[PDB]
């Protein structure tokens, strides 16, 4: 019953940075931890970043450290990430999940998950 | 470093088939496996979290079970809208929440 | 991973020889004032190194 929306989707080249956001409505989103997941196109699932239910924690996927930057506004109920310096490897279908704990490393996985939004880095029209 | 693998790669059966699944790890982790049905037209969703602890709101149809480095997943019917691809994650090692190939399966 | 060194991504214009910057405004990216509200082209100009 819960909705998980994003948006930010486009083009862009490589090299320029371009910010996600992602909507929460239908849970309480002031003690839950937030995650993102990729979808490569000819490829599985990717796990990209997560922060805890409020920011002390805060962990990146190995292939991104450095490159991304995972914020979160419990005030508007919503939450953010900024992509910096991308590659062509990051033209991947990028999910907004909701972690049933409320820490980053737990073993408790990802109950609900919403649509993607498909974004490509290149240079075209 | 902990590398996931699934075994089978496609399957094909009818409406009132029985299939298995099964998804090895490279490491003990103790039962710490998600399965996830993933629809080609929509958002993936959560079957069973933890070892063969069924998620409320499913139809119990699916069962899964297995511990330390072998799982096994069946479903008990599979009707004609249970055609999907899945995946199993593991989140007990150091590296977070790595995901195996997939499984793409037609119902004929 | 260590996250006490910074660099600066955005800027309204090139630096001149030897100047430092220390300021930390929210970098307009398009036409959309940010009014100190970070959101949609309103980017954060420092990213740390993994």
């Known amino acids: 019953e819960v909705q998980l929306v994003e948006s930010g989707g486009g083009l862009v080249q490589p090299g320029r940075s371009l910010r996600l956001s992602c909507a929460a409505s239908?849970?309480?989103?002031?003690?839950?931890?937030m995650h993102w997941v990729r979808q490569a196109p000819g490829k599985g699932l990717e796990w990209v970043s997560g922060?805890?239910?409020?920011?002390?924690?805060?962990d990146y996927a190995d292939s991104v450290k450095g490159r991304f930057t995972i914020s979160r506004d419990n005030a508007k109920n919503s939450l953010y990430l900024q992509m910096n310096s991308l590659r062509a490897e990051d033209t991947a279908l990028y999910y907004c999940?909701?972690?049933?704990?409320?820490?980053?490393?737990?073993?408790?996985?990802?109950?609900?998950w919403g649509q993607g939004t498909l974004v490509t880095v290149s240079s075209a029209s | 470093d902990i590398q996931m693998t699934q075994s089978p790669s496609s399957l094909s059966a009818s409406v009132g088939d029985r299939v298995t699944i099964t998804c090895r790890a490279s490491?003990?982790?103790?039962?710490?496996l998600n399965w996830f049905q993933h629809k080609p037209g929509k958002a993936p969703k959560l079957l069973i979290y933890?070892?063969?602890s069924l998620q409320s709101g499913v139809p119990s149809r699916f069962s899964g079970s297995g511990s330390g480095t072998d799982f096994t997943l069946t479903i008990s019917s599979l009707q004609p809208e249970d055609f999907a691809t899945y995946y199993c994650?593991?989140?007990?090692?150091?590296?977070?929440?790595?995901f195996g190939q997939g499984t793409k399966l037609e119902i004929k | 991973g260590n996250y006490n060194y910074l660099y600066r991504l955005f800027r309204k214009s090139n630096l001149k020889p030897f100047e430092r910057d220390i300021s930390t405004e929210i970098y307009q990216a398009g036409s959309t004032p940010c009014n100190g509200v970070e959101g949609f082209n309103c980017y954060f100009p420092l990213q740390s190194y993994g």
């Open positions: 239908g849970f309480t989103f002031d003690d839950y931890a």
């Open positions: 922060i805890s239910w409020n920011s002390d924690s805060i």
């Open positions: 933890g070892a063969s």
């Open positions: 490491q003990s982790i103790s039962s710490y």
């Open positions: 994650q593991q989140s007990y090692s150091t590296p977070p929440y790595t």
């Open positions: 999940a909701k972690d049933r704990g409320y820490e980053i490393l737990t073993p408790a996985s990802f109950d609900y």
